[PDB]
């Protein structure tokens, strides 16, 4: 869902 997708994108953008 939208909430889960936002968390995914958020943290993926901070990856090594």
């Amino acid at each position, epitope marked *: 869902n939208a909430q889960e997708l936002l968390e995914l994108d*958020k*943290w*993926a*953008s*901070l*990856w*090594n």
Partner: antibody
Amino acid sequence: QIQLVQSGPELKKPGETVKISCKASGYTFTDYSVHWVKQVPGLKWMGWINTETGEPTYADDFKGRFAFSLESSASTAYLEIHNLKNEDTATYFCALGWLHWGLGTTLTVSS
Amino acid sequence: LDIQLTQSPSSLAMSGGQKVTMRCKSSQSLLNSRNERNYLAWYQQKPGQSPKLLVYFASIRESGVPDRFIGSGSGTDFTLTISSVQAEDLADYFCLQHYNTPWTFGGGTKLEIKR
């Protein structure tokens, strides 16, 4: 929950080395990059370190005298500046990418 | 080529309760086609303090940040609005693009009291 704790103010003479620590908590240290930013009373991006491999990447203006390192088991990132010059006087921040900034460490270079 | 960010105005003299608007223009689109997020964040910084995240992915307010703060825009043009500005909002504000390295910061907007 997320915290970045930096070491205290530093006073250094020209030509010296300073080592600034950034101790991370509240998340998996090795999953996300740590960035370093310089601020003189605007902001300048210095580069980042890969917290999994330890590989540093430096911005063009920070290529010779600057070193990023890790003590991964302590969830700590380090910034070293060698051959200190008067222009290095500033506040240095570590950051968990764009998400969270450390409180900063001030550095004064003076004879 | 390095992404340039132009922030305006560099200074703004405010009155409590007014709508405050500041803008960030990038030299290249900050929109990631793979996830449709814009890689721009806005921060508040008070004297002798560290930057605090206000808005991320251009338009998403950070949790805990008062609802008077609003980000908008897409591609190359972004804005931060403070809908009813408060004395406690006196601070510097700046944008950050984290689309590509080197990351780049806008020159900042300094809010002051008008008199």
